[PDB]
Amino acid sequence: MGYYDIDDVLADGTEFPCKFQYDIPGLGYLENNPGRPITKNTKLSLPLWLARILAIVGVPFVELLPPDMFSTKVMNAIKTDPVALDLHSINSHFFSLAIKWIMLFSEKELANVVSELLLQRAQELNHHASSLSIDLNTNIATSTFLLKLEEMEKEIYKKSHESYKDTKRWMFK
Amino acid sequence: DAVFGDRVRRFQEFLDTFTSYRDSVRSIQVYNSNNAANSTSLNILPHRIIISLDDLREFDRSFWSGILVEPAYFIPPAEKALTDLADSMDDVPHPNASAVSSRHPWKLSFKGSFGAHALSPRTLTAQHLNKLVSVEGIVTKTSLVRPKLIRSVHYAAKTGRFHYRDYTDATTTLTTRIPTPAIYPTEDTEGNKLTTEYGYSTFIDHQRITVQEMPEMAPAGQLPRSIDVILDDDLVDKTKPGDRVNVVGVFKSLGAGGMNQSNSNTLIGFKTLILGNTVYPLHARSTGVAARQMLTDFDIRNINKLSKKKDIFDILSQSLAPSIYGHDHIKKAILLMLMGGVEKNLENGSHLRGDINILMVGDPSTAKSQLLRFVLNTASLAIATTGRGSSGVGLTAAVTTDRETGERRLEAGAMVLADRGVVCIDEFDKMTDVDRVAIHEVMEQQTVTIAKAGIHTTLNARCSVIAAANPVFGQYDVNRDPHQNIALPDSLLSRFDLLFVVTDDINEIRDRSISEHVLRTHRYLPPGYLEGEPVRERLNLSLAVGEDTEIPKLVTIPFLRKYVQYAKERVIPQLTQEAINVIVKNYTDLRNDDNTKKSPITARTLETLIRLATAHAKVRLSKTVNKVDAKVAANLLRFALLGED
Amino acid sequence: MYGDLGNKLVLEAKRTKQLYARSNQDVNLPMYHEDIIRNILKEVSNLRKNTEYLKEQQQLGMLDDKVAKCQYFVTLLCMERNKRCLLAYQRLRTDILDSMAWNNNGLDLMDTNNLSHQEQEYLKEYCDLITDLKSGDLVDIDLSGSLVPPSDVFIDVRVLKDAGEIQTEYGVFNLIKDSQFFVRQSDVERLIQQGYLQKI
Amino acid sequence: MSLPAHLQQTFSPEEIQFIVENEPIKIFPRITTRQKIRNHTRWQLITTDDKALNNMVAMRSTEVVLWIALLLKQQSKCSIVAPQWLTTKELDRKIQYEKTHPDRFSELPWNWLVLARILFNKAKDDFHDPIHELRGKIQDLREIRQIKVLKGLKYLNESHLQLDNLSLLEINELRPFITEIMDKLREIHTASLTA
Amino acid sequence: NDDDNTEIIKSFKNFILEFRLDSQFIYRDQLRNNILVKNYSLTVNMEHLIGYNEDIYKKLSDEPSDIIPLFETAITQVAKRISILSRNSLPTFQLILNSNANQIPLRDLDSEHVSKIVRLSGIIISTSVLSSRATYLSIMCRNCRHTTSITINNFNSIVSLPRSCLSKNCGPDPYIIIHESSKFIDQQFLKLQ
DNA sequence: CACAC
DNA sequence: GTGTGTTTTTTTTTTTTTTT
Numbered sequence A: 001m002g003y004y005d006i007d008d009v010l011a012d013g014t015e016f017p018c019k020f021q022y023d024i025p026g027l028g029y030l031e032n033n034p035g036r037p038i039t040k041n042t043k044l045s046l047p048l049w050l051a052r053i054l055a056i057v058g059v060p061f062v063e064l065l066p067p068d069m070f071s072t073k074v075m076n077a078i079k080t081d082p083v084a085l086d087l088h089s090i091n092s093h094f095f096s097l098a099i100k101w102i103m104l105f106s107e108k109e110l111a112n113v114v115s116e117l118l119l120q121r122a123q124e125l126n127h128h129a130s131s132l133s134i135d136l137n138t139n140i141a142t143s144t145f146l147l148k149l150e151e152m153e154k155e156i157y158k159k160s161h162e163s164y165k166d167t168k169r170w171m172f173k
Numbered sequence B: 001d002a003v004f005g006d007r008v009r010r011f012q013e014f015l016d017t018f019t020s021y022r023d024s025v026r027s028i029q030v031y032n033s034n035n036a037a038n039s040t041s042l043n044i045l046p047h048r049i050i051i052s053l054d055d056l057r058e059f060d061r062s063f064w065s066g067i068l069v070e071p072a073y074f075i076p077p078a079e080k081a082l083t084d085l086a087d088s089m090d091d092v093p094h095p096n097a098s099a100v101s102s103r104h105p106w107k108l109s110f111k112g113s114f115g116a117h118a119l120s121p122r123t124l125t126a127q128h129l130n131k132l133v134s135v136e137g138i139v140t141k142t143s144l145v146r147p148k149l150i151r152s153v154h155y156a157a158k159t160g161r162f163h164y165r166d167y168t169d170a171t172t173t174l175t176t177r178i179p180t181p182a183i184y185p186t187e188d189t190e191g192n193k194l195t196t197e198y199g200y201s202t203f204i205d206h207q208r209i210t211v212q213e214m215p216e217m218a219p220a221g222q223l224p225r226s227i228d229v230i231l232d233d234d235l236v237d238k239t240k241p242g243d244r245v246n247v248v249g250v251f252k253s254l255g256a257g258g259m260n261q262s263n264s265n266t267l268i269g270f271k272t273l274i275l276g277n278t279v280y281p282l283h284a285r286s287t288g289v290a291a292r293q294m295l296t297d298f299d300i301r302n303i304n305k306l307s308k309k310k311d312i313f314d315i316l317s318q319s320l321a322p323s324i325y326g327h328d329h330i331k332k333a334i335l336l337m338l339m340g341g342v343e344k345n346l347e348n349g350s351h352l353r354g355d356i357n358i359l360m361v362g363d364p365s366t367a368k369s370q371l372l373r374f375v376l377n378t379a380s381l382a383i384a385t386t387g388r389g390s391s392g393v394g395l396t397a398a399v400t401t402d403r404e405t406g407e408r409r410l411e412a413g414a415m416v417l418a419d420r421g422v423v424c425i426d427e428f429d430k431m432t433d434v435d436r437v438a439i440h441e442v443m444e445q446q447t448v449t450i451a452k453a454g455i456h457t458t459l460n461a462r463c464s465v466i467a468a469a470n471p472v473f474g475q476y477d478v479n480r481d482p483h484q485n486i487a488l489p490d491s492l493l494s495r496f497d498l499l500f501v502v503t504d505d506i507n508e509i510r511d512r513s514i515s516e517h518v519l520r521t522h523r524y525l526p527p528g529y530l531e532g533e534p535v536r537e538r539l540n541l542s543l544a545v546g547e548d549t550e551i552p553k554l555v556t557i558p559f560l561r562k563y564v565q566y567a568k569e570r571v572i573p574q575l576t577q578e579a580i581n582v583i584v585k586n587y588t589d590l591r592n593d594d595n596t597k598k599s600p601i602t603a604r605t606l607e608t609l610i611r612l613a614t615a616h617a618k619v620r621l622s623k624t625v626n627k628v629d630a631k632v633a634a635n636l637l638r639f640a641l642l643g644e645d
Numbered sequence C: 001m002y003g004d005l006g007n008k009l010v011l012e013a014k015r016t017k018q019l020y021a022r023s024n025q026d027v028n029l030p031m032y033h034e035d036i037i038r039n040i041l042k043e044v045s046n047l048r049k050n051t052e053y054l055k056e057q058q059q060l061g062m063l064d065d066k067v068a069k070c071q072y073f074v075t076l077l078c079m080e081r082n083k084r085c086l087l088a089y090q091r092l093r094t095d096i097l098d099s100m101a102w103n104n105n106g107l108d109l110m111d112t113n114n115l116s117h118q119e120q121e122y123l124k125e126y127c128d129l130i131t132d133l134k135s136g137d138l139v140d141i142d143l144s145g146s147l148v149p150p151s152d153v154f155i156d157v158r159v160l161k162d163a164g165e166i167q168t169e170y171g172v173f174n175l176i177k178d179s180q181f182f183v184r185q186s187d188v189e190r191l192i193q194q195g196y197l198q199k200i
Numbered sequence D: 001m002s003l004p005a006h007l008q009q010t011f012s013p014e015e016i017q018f019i020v021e022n023e024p025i026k027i028f029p030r031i032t033t034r035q036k037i038r039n040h041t042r043w044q045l046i047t048t049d050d051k052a053l054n055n056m057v058a059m060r061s062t063e064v065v066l067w068i069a070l071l072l073k074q075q076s077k078c079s080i081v082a083p084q085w086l087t088t089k090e091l092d093r094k095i096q097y098e099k100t101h102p103d104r105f106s107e108l109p110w111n112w113l114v115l116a117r118i119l120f121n122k123a124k125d126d127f128h129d130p131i132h133e134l135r136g137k138i139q140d141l142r143e144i145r146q147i148k149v150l151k152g153l154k155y156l157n158e159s160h161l162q163l164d165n166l167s168l169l170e171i172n173e174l175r176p177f178i179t180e181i182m183d184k185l186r187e188i189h190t191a192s193l194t195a
Numbered sequence E: 001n002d003d004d005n006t007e008i009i010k011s012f013k014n015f016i017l018e019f020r021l022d023s024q025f026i027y028r029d030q031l032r033n034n035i036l037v038k039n040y041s042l043t044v045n046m047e048h049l050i051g052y053n054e055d056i057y058k059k060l061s062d063e064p065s066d067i068i069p070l071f072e073t074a075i076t077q078v079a080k081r082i083s084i085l086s087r088n089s090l091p092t093f094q095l096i097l098n099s100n101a102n103q104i105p106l107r108d109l110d111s112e113h114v115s116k117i118v119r120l121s122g123i124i125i126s127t128s129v130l131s132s133r134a135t136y137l138s139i140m141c142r143n144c145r146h147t148t149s150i151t152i153n154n155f156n157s158i159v160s161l162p163r164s165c166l167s168k169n170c171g172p173d174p175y176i177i178i179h180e181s182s183k184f185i186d187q188q189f190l191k192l193q
Numbered sequence F: 001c002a003c004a005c
Numbered sequence G: 001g002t003g004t005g006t007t008t009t010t011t012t013t014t015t016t017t018t019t020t
């Protein structure tokens, strides 16, 4: 959560569904009505970095609604088959946003689910990372699994696979 | 068989844990009992229960894993447990002297998340045999519904006793058992003659359909692959060819694969198929919703509120194809077609069709095909056709032979499948003349007739026809009358409600606006996509299987589809004298008009006016037609004919 | 909303991050995106003008604390986010420039058109600072030397680019092209770094 | 930056080799540096003790730092002695011990893999055992330890971990993955425990 | 025949465990990596096997249809040894070969070369759908209910249900396939031009 | 497969 | 009692090809 983390910066600017609590005047600069105000009980999508502050200061101005990524459907999908889930399709920065949402809401069950998902997928990505192709003179499963990773999983995978490749190169040099 | 009883008891404990299934069973039983106690009634509820896999996983992960890994040893115990539970809480009414003999096993159905078991016919590898899988596809072939014996009842007219003999097949029961020779025992063990007691014997409806993957996820250079599914009991006739569907069932294997001294070295494989347990009819090409889209009360209220908008017609027309610049009146006509006027089923065999058929002919690269593609992507029931890529036999009805039974049968064509739907025909001028008479008969009387191969039938295709056409020359010649510019008979043109002429005249301001709009369209970037990144498609959005004032410029396409469905279902407009005066006045003025000399205006134009007025009344959700409907219909027809405004 | 420019800028920044991350291609920085910088600067200036406008209009007018506080706070948070995006992009460029300077201090001092004037001056002074650190107290050791352990002392090398004759510490090296030396790895590290000798 | 990204928190295998190069090992000097009672320059180093080097006697085993022994082994002026764990019997006993206890690692010296690689590369002819068998047994031990590591990975908790008796190279190669997964699991728990 | 089969299997197991060019057991590493990604197969290069021992290559080339299943069994045993701690249910691995022999023209295939090893070229013109061939076949005796299992090599010699009860007579065809317990693999038919 | 040759 | 023998199909519908 460092200030200059590029992944954190990208994750901050993600729209989230959230209704309003006041008929606040003069807002909507790019929300389809620059001069016209924003009405009470209005459901709009707002960037997470701004919605975070707007959800605490106030009764808070904005009531955050549960996003589609953390709906009970996705929860059931995660609890069913963590390995065969294309989490990249759900979002490129799913784990960071899960961490931020849990930190804001102290929602322990989501944290318990996401930790299990992370462990189960870490097992498989380590299996793939330590698998090094050797030329007798890019496996199909490797690539078809790599597309279902967020940037952090793609980063841990790159680092671990680089370490494995360096070890193999030094060992057999 | 101790494991069987253990699974039965754990399943019953799970059922008691979630009483919602018990309530559903109670509702089904009381509904059936009330219908039996109540007449021209035939709607009886089935003995099937839909459970969510998520609840089973939360309760007992071992049982859920056994279900999803080796269902042949876990679902039969669950069915036994459900039957025992149903009997225990059954209202124990007076027996019919048949239900005691006619068994009624309570089928199981599943929904929710499936993970890696959500597959397609192409990806259904042999490793998934004996494993419960969910496969999406299109219904293409459907065998005839054929009942089969599972239990025969016999009466001994020397002892007054009833003997039952249960019949099992590899395609009926999941667990493998010795096949029964399907012979009725006419004699008792003690030399007593037995009479087969039909009605007390038990037969089940059986069907065998073919499910093939999407053509659009079919990989480059490969044709779609297909699998065979065996729907049984309730699931028969629940689907028809051309339906998108997701089936949940066991991937079973059958056959001998040689291995019988008939084929020792011959390398033939085994028969593989699916015993369907659940059918979910995803449709409308939205990948996750059915054609009969569910309407929430909020959506209905919003639809009613938007119906009070003055120019809701224009808003919906413009919201149809935002990426297609201009062609506003064409969009209005398309919206009228999608949700058309009333069909008059008059007496004495008279029939006035309510569908609107429009032929639009125009210059090349004028979005003629793109409009039809959009209508295909939007309409609830839309079938694509190409004039070159179509045969009349493959368009209306094909005389094939059945394989399950081995005898002749008819298969629906392109328009019969589109009954109550829309047919989008591109390259209409390129259609074969010999098969063009068939579509002429369709658009004339909405029915086809077959009198070949000892089959004399009349099928109903009450579809709405939209056609895209090109001029006889490479481009339209305005110096020539609109008869030689079209290579189609005027009788064929007559049945069309509207004929739209599209001219690609080279303007400068209009050309600039078109170019700017097209560039805005081409520079669009999908939300979850980066610049310079190929737009890959997976469409694995089935994370769970099954059901699991205001003045906006443009409404969302699914919301528009919901509005169209609600309007088609609910409002049945009535033509009004105030509309009658306007309609008759406009028809008279157009008929005896000097500029209308080149027009084919006849009595059919009056039918077109009535249909347009009814469709416009449907647009306003008014249960009766009004003057504004007639005025708008007259203006649109006058635009279609003359084009001045 | 308002952070779209910063969002595109940080997306490009991460793109450059993966670009330089792959192997060790030692590519020059992508051209300074002065366009996005100027656009977001104009956005920030307009939002600052809006803040001043709201302040003066609240002073002259009768605006309750609710709207005056809320719009001003939202705009301030908008500047916070945009400034953070700019800071992240500039920090990425600074760190990659640091990498180029540290690795190439003994290699080469170079297309500078991809960098802004501030970045060019930063690199020019940072080379001076690195040299000052090398010559200050830790001059006995070479701070810019190779970070790989000196596993072997004597190695063989082949001349890639003929440099005629170059005086080494004690003798002299006749860097005839397509000729192979077998000498100490210690006194030829800089030449190999520059790209004159190839074999290990 | 001053430190390249791939060297941020882990050691490159070359660094592990360099670290292991400072371990003392027993060798047979092929020269005799013992200046008799009846000039020459002593090693007089500062990273190690020169006393043994200045007093080497031909074919009399001494103990010196590993990398000096390798430098001498560049010529035929020395000879490396394999440690007692580099015998076929000890390797077989360790194999049996590993196969006997599936949940605990063998008690090998922490630098066994790198030492084996270095000795095989540069001292391939100083073993009483067939080198083609030693290589196979070393590879078998590496595979068995990998299999054990993978099974021990299925219990990655969020508090701590005990990798007992594990070697150095395996730890170095597994550091970037385990130390990063453990960080994310700790962060999730801490975010949950924000009350 | 069992002694010869064990001899060949042990020889191939030794070849897998020992073959290496320079300090790297190439086949061991390849097998481990393939197991890591659930790829139960192995690409064996022909020159490597030839260089290891010419006798093994000659025995393979004489009767490949009988030698290859033993090689697959040895591969499975090696996989169990070096991928699972002793003290199952692992499918039999599929062997893949690579060679540099002279490519025989397609029309040059004749009455000879039968049951030999042939290398050739062509262009694919037809790819049928995937059928299923059984490898593990649970089978049930019809009358006395004596259940057993059968293992199929899928390498046709030049197999059917047993023609006896094998423990009352139960008939000459007393066996029925137990589909829910058997194991199958995918098979595809191609047409080369 | 099974009843008839 | 060992081993057989059926039931079992070439329509209608596409696509090509030569005349016309």
Ligand SMILES: Nc1ncnc2c1ncn2[C@@H]1O[C@H](COP(=O)(O)OP(=O)(O)O)[C@@H](O)[C@H]1O
Residues within 6 Å of the ligand: B323, B324, B325, B326, B327, B362, B363, B364, B365, B366, B367, B368, B369, B370, B371, B468, B514, B518
């Ligand atoms: N009015 C229009 N607005 C936007 N695009 C258009 C328009 N007219 C034509 N096009 C473009 O022309 C292309 C080809 O159109 P097409 O459907 O082939 O027309 P036709 O069937 O008349 O040849 C389409 O990609 C479409 O984007």
Ligand SMILES: [Mg+2]
Residues within 6 Å of the ligand: B365, B366, B367, B368, B369, B370
């Ligand atoms: Mg077109």
Ligand SMILES: [Zn+2]
Residues within 6 Å of the ligand: E141, E142, E143, E144, E145, E146, E165, E166, E167, E168, E169, E170, E174
């Ligand atoms: Zn028997």
